[PDB]
């Protein structure tokens, strides 16, 4: 049951989005240190951490982009190119590719995925 | 007079990068509430906030990319298309376009700009 170095989607704020990152260390009491893709390293409780290296397909997510700001869409495909992972988020009936860090889950979506994928 | 609604590059961690965002509110004691482009809204001290809506040209920055991870480069141009702003970061003698959220300043790089652009 090694959970070190596994990419996970976890929230680091009491009321915030579930941002993507990777587990850098497994501390006691189920509190894992996560280095997030944006460079912020901090400790997060297992409940707040979702063990989803590939974002599940056909899962509602929040896509962050300069255009449309914080849109809501559904994953409709994955594409790993030269290590870079992209998710095909369908917003308003239109599929667009978003980087791993450009896709984060809302509180409701994170809670929905916690039941199945939750540390 | 007011700094609210002005894009700024500020750090929200004691030892962290200067992430881009926008001032959502001006609170007392020079402590401004910033909504960052990643959706994290929190209060930041004026020292940690850099007033640079367009990232300064010919300024050393840290480009975050899936490939090359946290590379370092220098801005060599800007391009705003349909609101989306891209910076031409020159890494290893090669100019590559990065989104606004894809470019963040390091501790030393951000400090170097504090003397000029610092709240």
């Amino acid at each position: 049951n090694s959970f070190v170095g596994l990419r996970v989607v976890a929230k680091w704020s009491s009321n915030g989005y579930f941002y993507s990152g990777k587990i850098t260390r497994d501390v006691g009491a189920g509190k894992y240190k996560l280095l997030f893709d944006d460079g912020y390293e901090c400790d997060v409780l297992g409940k707040d951490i979702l063990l989803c290296d590939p974002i599940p397909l056909d899962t509602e997510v929040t896509a962050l982009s300069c255009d449309e700001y914080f849109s809501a869409g559904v994953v409709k495909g994955h594409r790993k190119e030269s290590g870079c992972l992209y998710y095909s988020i369908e917003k308003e009936g239109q599929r667009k590719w978003y980087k791993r860090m450009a896709v984060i889950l809302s509180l409701e979506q994170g809670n929905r995925l916690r039941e199945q994928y939750g540390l």
Side-chain angles (χ1 to χ4, degrees), chain A:
Chain A
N1 304 357
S2 176
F3 312 120
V4 181
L6 292 74
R7 289 186 181 277
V8 292
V9 181
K11 69 176 183 61
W12 39 274
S13 304
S14 178
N15 188 57
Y17 295 73
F18 290 68
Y19 303 74
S20 52
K22 188 181 65 57
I23 297 144
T24 174
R25 162 162 48 185
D26 181 4
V27 199
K31 189 169 199 179
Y32 308 77
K33 193 170 196 179
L34 310 191
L35 169 55
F36 287 107
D37 295 303
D38 65 299
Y40 177 53
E41 202 172 301
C42 75
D43 300 0
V44 188
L45 309 189
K47 53 184 179 180
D48 296 357
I49 306 176
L50 308 176
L51 189 61
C52 286
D53 173 6
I55 289 291
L57 180 63
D58 295 303
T59 298
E60 194 177 302
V61 314
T62 308
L64 274 62
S65 39
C66 36
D67 170 61
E68 307 286 358
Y69 296 68
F70 296 71
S71 62
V74 175
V75 175
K76 302 292 297 181
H78 315 122
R79 173 185 182 172
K80 201 187 299 197
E81 182 165 1
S82 312
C84 301
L85 173 58
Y86 293 79
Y87 308 113
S88 183
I89 308 311
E90 184 166 1
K91 184 221 174 277
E92 212 180 62
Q94 179 57 288
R95 281 189 201 130
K96 173 165 158 200
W97 281 114
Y98 293 93
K99 292 176 175 53
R100 186 188 298 251
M101 60 173 89
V103 177
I104 65 186
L105 288 176
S106 78
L107 214 66
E108 175 171 2
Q109 297 144 5
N111 194 65
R112 275 155 149 63
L113 299 189
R114 163 156 38 232
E115 179 181 2
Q116 185 171 2
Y117 320 107
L119 297 193

